Design a protein around this ligand. Structure first.
Ligand SMILES: NCc1ccc([N+](=O)[O-])cc1
Ligand SMILES: NCc1ccc([N+](=O)[O-])cc1
Ligand SMILES: NCc1ccc([N+](=O)[O-])cc1
Ligand SMILES: NCc1ccc([N+](=O)[O-])cc1
Lengths: 358, 122, 357, 109
């Protein structure tokens, strides 16, 4: 009477889709990406990502990129670090791209697995434990460059105003900028002046990223900025997130992917909690503060729902927040965000959610 | 007749373990995994083999043969886990038995989710 | 202080139990958790990839696992293997290649066994056509495929013979297989019909004596196979149920749901009330203790929602397992006494086993 | 005790305590391999009022122990201070990088 068929595509349009990167830390060799419709909470599909997978969606919205590690016998045997290319609509494996066996194994901060603005290179973090940035040429489907200049630095911040440039945060408290050539090799680089004191005011690595500048928050609730409108990065800060009334309760930021920028308004979103002290930098959000980055002032504050990570959609004026297991959807078209819905049980242990590009 | 077409039913009804055609399902319902009662989630492969159940349709009063084809080649869906054992039998009645992985003959035997396909009247 | 490895399990072998955690929600990361039953301490573990099975060598020196790998887990070439692990160091020693048809399924004891003499591992295959695989431990080789066992299921070794075992067949009888010194089938026999497959199907889990095995049925009857002699003699049914039991519809339920204390002939069974079609895998409302000679129940105690069990003969102990927690019972007297519960021994285990002593 | 996440030496552990996994504070469970590298923490010993360097060498080559998961972040810093950072796998350089559990080894003041 009926026959089971496969070969099917994701049921909901790309504009509805979000990607929840589930580390499944209790069984980290079976990490995976869960694909959800953010409009109604519907589970749409998944992509298996083996041990500590990382994920992103191609800029063109056609492909899902994953990064993972295999061994011949999982807990023994030869290692293979790879980038995989999967079809976005069919959620099927297409290609493996070999990496040297030193891709970063760690929690899913955005900046460990990124791409150039032009979508032509995948840019990832290595640690052997010496740090370098690896470059994958999408057209070739090959690894093409180890950016050893980035030794002593961490994470990848693409520059949205340049086709194949990105920045990274270094142990001197400045930023190193890398400009790739069309072959994916380093064409030029520069190093900013010192932005922040590593010892006295360490920043969270998560950028609040605009077209031509990036803002960063610190352990103590200060904000630093990096302007890349020009060839050399100019740095500035601190200004404090806190007003006088905030200081009494020791408000400080906390989380993982803990900030976001709504570019059209200049509004920066930041997870915060009171009673800050040494060791509270990864605490869940008591509140989400909304800062006007031009005036350097808070314009809104709402309850945080114990969120740890966020992402923003510019076009639809949305913010997602994630507490490890549940995803909250907010309308951020006005300064005060409005909670639309919560997707319960989207993951067991996810610190990263991303929109499908539209 | 409407109770024979899960695509017409409310999704909460068909995604429940008590839905009449799920009477020998031991696994995750594909309908909660981005598939439907009779279609695999994207990027998972139907099993060419299955165990079979006979389940009573309380809506039309007839008994039906249901084939529990799995979808394979992806890791465990994890949603709508069901464990119903109506007329299920041990491994010496192998095609009535559900404590084995019916992805076993697939190119990749990783168990993703389970479907309930209507074969016809019992 | 310097961190070191190379260490052996801290507790004596006689204290050790093996909880086979399927981790069904993440079945590619199944593992064996090793515990000390005397104090509930976690002693270590062995990773077993997708749907691992486990046993301990008869001599107590090695752990055997059976599992499936693929080059890229969800794609790539399949490798079905047996692995040999040191029991004290919990380290991998040797891989034995299998044909890619080892049974993928829940951890009934009978899917992965060994001969009494310890020389051969005997495992269940399904392609979906069933056969029994023989692995020569010393040679590290798969040596015989028993296709004569087609249409049968599970391995019941005969403790009174060095390299013989039985399997339950779709005819309601037992097929006995006797191996030669090289692991090839030397001889085989089929018993007469023990049970009606359609009218009174049995659970596969044997309550195993030295020279006979008892089985319980979906409807609460008991069957036996005696292999003291040259051919298997079969008997039954007798009912576990008295009149009051019957009126409340008590039936057995579980997975590895029975056990036998050999010295006393007491048989242990998981039972639940309100039995009907579809309740054969329900958790135990009670454990019933039957005297297999008088065919009378001698005890009934709370079941603690248990699903599987195992017995240690020498220490007069029963373990029960509800999927996550392990209960330890003293069974030296007809009424069992609960000694302790080990909470969170697994996420999804249907099998626990003692280390051989 | 040492199995408590609040035990003073565990002040920058984000993982499973090996002492709950068949090992000890300073020994890997059987068949898991020590990492030759680690992040380091600075923890206050309340018993003597002195602060100590603690090395958080992992045990590797087995799947997640899953017991006594601790997450303390005292003096922990991001990846640009790499050996003070605990959001990466310190089994990353082992023959097999699968993460099993974390040890807390006293180095010195
Ligand atoms: N230090 C804990 C830890 C271990 C492994 C990962 N990882 O992603 O593989 C993250 C964090
Ligand atoms: N041990 C750090 C950590 C904290 C929160 C999550 N999570 O998924 O919410 C994962 C890992
Ligand atoms: N029918 C569900 C199911 C699937 C896979 C296994 N297994 O052991 O791999 C057991 C049971
Ligand atoms: N769906 C069948 C089943 C039931 C119980 C367990 N368990 O571990 O208790 C595992 C698998």
């Amino acid at each position: 009477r009926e026959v089971l068929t496969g070969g099917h595509s994701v049921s909901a349009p790309q504009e509805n889709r979000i990607y929840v990167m589930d580390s499944v830390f209790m069984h980290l060799t079976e990490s995976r990406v869960h694909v959800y419709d953010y409009t109604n909470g519907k589970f749409l599909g998944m992509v298996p990502t083996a041990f500590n997978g990382h994920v992103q969606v191609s800029n063109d919205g056609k492909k899902i990129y994953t990064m993972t590690t295999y061994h011949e016998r999982i807990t023994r045997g030869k290692r293979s670090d790879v980038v995989e290319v999967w079809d976005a609509d069919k959620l099927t494996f297409e290609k493996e791209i070999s990496l040297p066996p030193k891709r970063v194994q760690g929690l899913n901060y955005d900046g460990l697995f990124r791409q150039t603005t032009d979508g032509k290179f995948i840019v990832l973090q290595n640690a052997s434990p010496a740090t370098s940035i690896g470059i994958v040429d999408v057209a070739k489907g090959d690894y093409v460059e180890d950016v050893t200049a980035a030794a002593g630095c961490w994470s990848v911040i693409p520059q949205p105003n340049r086709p194949r440039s990105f920045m990274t945060i270094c142990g001197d408290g400045g930023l190193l900028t890398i400009n790739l050539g069309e072959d994916g090799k380093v064409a030029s680089q520069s190093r900013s002046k010192q932005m922040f004191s590593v010892k006295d005011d360490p920043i969270f690595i998560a950028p609040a990223l605009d077209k031509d500048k990036a803002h960063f928050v610190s352990y103590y609730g200060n904000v630093y900025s990096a302007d890349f409108s020009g060839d050399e990065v100019k740095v500035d800060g601190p200004w404090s997130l806190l007003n006088d009334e905030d200081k009494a309760k020791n408000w400080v930021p906390g989380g993982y992917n803990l900030v976001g920028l709504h570019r059209a308004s200049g509004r920066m979103y930041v997870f915060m909690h009171p009673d800050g002290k040494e060791g509270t930098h990864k605490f869940p959000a008591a509140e989400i503060w909304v800062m006007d980055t031009k005036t350097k002032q808070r314009v809104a504050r709402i309850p945080g729902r114990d969120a740890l990570s966020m992402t923003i959609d510019q076009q639809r004026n949305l913010m997602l927040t994630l507490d490890g297991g549940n995803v909250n959807v907010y309308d951020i078209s006005q300064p005060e965000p409005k909670l639309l819905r919560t997707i319960e049980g989207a993951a067991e242990a996810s610190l990263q959610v991303q929109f499908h590009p539209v | 007749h409407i109770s024979l077409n899960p695509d017409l039913a409310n999704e909460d009804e068909v995604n429940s373990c008590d839905y009449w055609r799920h009477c020998a399902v031991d696994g995750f319902l594909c309908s909660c995994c981005g598939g439907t009662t009779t279609t695999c989630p994207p990027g998972s492969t139907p099993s060419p083999i299955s165990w079979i159940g006979t389940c009573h349709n309380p809506h039309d009063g007839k008994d039906y043969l249901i084939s529990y084809h799995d979808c394979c080649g992806k890791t465990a869906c994890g949603r709508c886990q069901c464990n119903t054992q109506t007329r299920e039998r041990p491994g010496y009645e192998f095609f009535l038995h559900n404590d084995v992985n019916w992805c076993m003959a697939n190119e990749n035997s990783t168990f993703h989710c389970t479907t309930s396909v209507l074969v016809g009247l019992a």
